[PDB]
Coordinates of C-alpha atoms in Angstrom, one line a residue:
X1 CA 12.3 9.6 4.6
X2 CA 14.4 11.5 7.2
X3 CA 17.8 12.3 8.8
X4 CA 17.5 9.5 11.2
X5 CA 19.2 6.1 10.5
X6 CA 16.6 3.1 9.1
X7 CA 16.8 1.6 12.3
X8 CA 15.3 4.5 13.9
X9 CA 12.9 5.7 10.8
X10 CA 11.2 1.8 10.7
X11 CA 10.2 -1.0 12.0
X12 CA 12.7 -3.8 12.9
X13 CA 11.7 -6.3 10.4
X14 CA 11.7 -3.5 8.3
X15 CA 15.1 -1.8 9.1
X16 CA 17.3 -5.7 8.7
X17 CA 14.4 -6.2 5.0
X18 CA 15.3 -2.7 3.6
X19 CA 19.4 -2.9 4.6
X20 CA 20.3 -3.0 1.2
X21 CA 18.2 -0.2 -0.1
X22 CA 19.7 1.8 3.3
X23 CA 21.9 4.5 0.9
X24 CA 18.8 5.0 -1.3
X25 CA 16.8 5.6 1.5
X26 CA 18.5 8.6 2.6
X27 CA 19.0 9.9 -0.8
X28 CA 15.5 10.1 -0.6
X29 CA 14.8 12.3 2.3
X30 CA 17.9 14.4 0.8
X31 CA 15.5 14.6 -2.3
X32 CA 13.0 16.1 -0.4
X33 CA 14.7 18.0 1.3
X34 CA 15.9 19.9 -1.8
X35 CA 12.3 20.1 -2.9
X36 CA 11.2 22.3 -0.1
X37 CA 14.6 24.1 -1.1
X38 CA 13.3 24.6 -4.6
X39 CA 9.7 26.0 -3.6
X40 CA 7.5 22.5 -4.1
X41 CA 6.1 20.8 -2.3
X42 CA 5.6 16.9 -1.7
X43 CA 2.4 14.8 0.3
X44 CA 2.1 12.8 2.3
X45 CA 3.7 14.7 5.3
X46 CA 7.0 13.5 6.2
X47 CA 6.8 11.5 9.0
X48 CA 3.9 9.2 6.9
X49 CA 6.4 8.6 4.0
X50 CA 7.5 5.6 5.2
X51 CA 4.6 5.0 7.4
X52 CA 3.5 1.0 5.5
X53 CA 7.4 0.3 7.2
X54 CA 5.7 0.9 10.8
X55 CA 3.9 -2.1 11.2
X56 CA 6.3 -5.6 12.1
X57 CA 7.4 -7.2 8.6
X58 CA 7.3 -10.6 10.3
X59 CA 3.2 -10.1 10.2
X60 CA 2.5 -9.2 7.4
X61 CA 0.3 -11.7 5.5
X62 CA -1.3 -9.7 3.0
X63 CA 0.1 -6.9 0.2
X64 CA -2.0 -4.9 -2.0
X65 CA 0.5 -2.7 -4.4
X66 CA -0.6 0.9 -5.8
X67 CA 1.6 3.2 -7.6
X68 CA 1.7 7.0 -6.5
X69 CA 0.0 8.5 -3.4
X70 CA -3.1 11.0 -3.6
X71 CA -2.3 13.8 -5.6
X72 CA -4.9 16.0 -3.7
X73 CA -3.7 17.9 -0.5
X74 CA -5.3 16.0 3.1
X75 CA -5.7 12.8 1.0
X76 CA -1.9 10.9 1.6
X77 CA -1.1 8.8 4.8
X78 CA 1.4 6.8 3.5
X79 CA -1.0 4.0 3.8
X80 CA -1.8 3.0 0.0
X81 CA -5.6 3.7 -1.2
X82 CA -6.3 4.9 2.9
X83 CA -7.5 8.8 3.9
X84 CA -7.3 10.7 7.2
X85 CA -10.7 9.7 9.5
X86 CA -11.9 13.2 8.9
X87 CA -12.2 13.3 4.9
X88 CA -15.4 13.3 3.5
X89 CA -16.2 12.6 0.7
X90 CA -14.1 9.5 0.4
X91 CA -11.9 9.6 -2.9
X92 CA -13.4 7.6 -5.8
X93 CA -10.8 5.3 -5.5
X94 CA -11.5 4.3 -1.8
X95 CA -15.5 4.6 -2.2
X96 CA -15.3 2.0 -5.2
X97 CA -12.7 -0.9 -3.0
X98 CA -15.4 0.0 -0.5
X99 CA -18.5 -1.0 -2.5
X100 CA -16.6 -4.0 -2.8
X101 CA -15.6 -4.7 0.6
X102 CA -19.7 -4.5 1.5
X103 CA -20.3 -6.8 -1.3
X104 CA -17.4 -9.5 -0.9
X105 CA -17.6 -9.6 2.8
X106 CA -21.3 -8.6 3.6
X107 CA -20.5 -5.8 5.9
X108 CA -21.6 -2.6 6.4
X109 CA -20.3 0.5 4.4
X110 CA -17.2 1.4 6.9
X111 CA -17.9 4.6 9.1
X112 CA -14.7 6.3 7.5
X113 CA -11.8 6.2 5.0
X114 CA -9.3 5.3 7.6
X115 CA -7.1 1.9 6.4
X116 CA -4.8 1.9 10.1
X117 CA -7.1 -1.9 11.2
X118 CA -5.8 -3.5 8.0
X119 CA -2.3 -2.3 8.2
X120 CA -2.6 -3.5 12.5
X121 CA -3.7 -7.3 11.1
X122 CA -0.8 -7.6 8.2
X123 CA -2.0 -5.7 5.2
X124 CA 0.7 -3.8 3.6
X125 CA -0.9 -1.0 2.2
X126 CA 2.6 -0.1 -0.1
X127 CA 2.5 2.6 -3.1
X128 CA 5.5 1.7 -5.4
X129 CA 6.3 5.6 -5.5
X130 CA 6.0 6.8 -2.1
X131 CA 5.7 10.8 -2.6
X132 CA 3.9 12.8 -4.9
X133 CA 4.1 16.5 -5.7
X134 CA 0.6 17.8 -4.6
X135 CA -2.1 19.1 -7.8
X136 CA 0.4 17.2 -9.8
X137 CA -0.4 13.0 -10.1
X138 CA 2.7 10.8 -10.6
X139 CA 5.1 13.5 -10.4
X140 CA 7.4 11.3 -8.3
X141 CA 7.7 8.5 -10.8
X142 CA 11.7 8.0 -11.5
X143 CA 12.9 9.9 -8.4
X144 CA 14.4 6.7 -7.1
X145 CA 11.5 5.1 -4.6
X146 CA 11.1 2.8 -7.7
X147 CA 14.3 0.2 -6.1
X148 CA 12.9 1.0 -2.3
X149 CA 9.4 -0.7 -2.7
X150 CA 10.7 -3.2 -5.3
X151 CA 13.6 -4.3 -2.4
X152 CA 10.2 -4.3 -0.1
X153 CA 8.8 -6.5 -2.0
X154 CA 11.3 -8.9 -3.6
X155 CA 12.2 -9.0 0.8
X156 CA 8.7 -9.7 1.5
X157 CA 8.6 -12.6 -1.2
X158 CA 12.0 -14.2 0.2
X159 CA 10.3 -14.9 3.6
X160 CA 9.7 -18.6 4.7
X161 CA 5.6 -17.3 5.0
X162 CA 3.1 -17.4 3.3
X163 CA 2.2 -14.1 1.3
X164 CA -1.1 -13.2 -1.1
X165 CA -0.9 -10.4 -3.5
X166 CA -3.4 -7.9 -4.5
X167 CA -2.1 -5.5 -7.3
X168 CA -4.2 -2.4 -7.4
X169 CA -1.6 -0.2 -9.6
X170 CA -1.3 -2.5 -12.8
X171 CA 2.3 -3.3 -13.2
X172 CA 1.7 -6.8 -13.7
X173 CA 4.7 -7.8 -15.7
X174 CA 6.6 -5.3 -13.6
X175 CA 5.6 -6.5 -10.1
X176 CA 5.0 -10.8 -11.0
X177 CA 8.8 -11.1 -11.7
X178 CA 9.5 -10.0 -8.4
X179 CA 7.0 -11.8 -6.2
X180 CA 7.5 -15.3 -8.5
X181 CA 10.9 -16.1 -6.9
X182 CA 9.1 -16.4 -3.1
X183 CA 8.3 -19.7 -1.8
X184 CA 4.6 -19.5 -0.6
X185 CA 3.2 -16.5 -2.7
X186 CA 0.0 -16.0 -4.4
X187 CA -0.7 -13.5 -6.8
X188 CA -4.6 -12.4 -7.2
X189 CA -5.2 -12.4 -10.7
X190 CA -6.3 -10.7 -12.7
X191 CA -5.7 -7.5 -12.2
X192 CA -8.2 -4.6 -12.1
X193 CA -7.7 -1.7 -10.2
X194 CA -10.3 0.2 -8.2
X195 CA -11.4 2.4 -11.1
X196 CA -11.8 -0.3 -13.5
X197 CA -14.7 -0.6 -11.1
X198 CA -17.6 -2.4 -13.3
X199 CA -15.2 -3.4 -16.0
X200 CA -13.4 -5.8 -13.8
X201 CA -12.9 -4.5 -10.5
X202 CA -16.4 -4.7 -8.9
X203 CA -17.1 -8.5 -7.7
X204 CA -13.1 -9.6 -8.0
X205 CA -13.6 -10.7 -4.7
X206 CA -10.1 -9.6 -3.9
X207 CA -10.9 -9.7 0.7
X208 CA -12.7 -13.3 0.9
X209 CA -10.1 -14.7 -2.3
X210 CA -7.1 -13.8 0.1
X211 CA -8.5 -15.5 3.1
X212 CA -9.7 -18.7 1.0
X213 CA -5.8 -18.5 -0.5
X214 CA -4.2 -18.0 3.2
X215 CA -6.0 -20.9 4.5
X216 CA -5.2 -23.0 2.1
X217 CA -1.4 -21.8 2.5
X218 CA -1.8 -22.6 6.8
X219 CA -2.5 -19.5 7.5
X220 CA -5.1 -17.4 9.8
X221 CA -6.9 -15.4 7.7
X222 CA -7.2 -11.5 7.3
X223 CA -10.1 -9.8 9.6
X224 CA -10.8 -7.3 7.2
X225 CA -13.7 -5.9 9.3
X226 CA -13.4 -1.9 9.6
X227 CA -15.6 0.2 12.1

């Protein structure tokens, strides 16, 4: 977050969607604030934060759910799962939703790690913990993002449109409460996450189930074609 007011840190959509979490907002960017004040550090860099609020809430079609950013420094965009186009290798995570994007959709192995096409085209790419303390996984668990990305979400469900949900941070019983009281929502089930990866998450089909599920909802379907 930031000093800003929502209006001015968000989309539009976004700013009207996340009213009610407004206050909690800016206790976050206080809380980061007093990090740097207390010698640590936090990832992704500030202005990515709250970057999955950049793209129009009115398009979004698609939401794939993750927990906590990239612990590793030059990893966190803000975009769930997503890496900077210059990082090579790709983290594990990223290189196994990739074997499966080349073997649900048929296309080629993308040329980097770079998720911005998916989150242009309606794919909310949202961590339910938005920060992380770098070297130091889920270190931002219970800091208060927790009621942010659920108020995303339960907002997202409460639209007259239709919505498919990939959970790739577990939380099932967690996260299916909160998406069961929308109107045209389907949940992707079950629920392996990229590591899982040939105990479940290889060949869930997650890219061509969402498009077969949109369609049948009225929906375009997701291009999910990278270059």
């Amino acid at each position: 977050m930031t000093a800003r007011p929502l209006s001015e840190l968000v989309e539009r959509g976004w700013a009207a969607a996340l009213e009610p979490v407004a206050d909690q907002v800016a206790h976050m960017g206080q809380f980061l604030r007093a990090e740097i004040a207390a010698g640590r550090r936090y990832l992704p860099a500030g202005s990515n934060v709250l970057r999955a609020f950049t793209f129009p809430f009115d398009n979004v079609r698609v939401l794939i759910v993750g927990q906590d950013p990239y612990p590793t420094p030059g990893h966190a965009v803000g975009l769930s799962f997503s890496v900077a186009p210059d990082v090579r290798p790709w983290p594990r995570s990223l290189a196994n939703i990739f074997d499966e994007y080349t073997a649900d959709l048929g296309y080629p192995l993308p040329s980097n790690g770079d998720l911005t096409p998916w989150a242009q085209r309606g794919v909310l790419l949202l961590n339910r913990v938005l920060t992380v303390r770098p070297s130091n996984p889920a270190s931002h668990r219970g800091k208060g993002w927790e009621a942010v990305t659920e108020c995303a979400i339960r907002a997202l469900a409460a639209r007259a449109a239709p919505l498919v949900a990939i959970l790739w941070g577990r939380d099932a019983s967690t996260l299916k409460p909160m998406l069961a009281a929308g109107n045209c929502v389907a949940i992707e089930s079950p629920h392996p996450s990229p590591l899982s990866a040939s105990r479940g998450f290889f060949g869930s089909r997650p890219f061509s189930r969402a498009n077969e599920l949109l369609v049948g909802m009225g929906a375009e379907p997701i291009d999910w074609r990278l270059p």
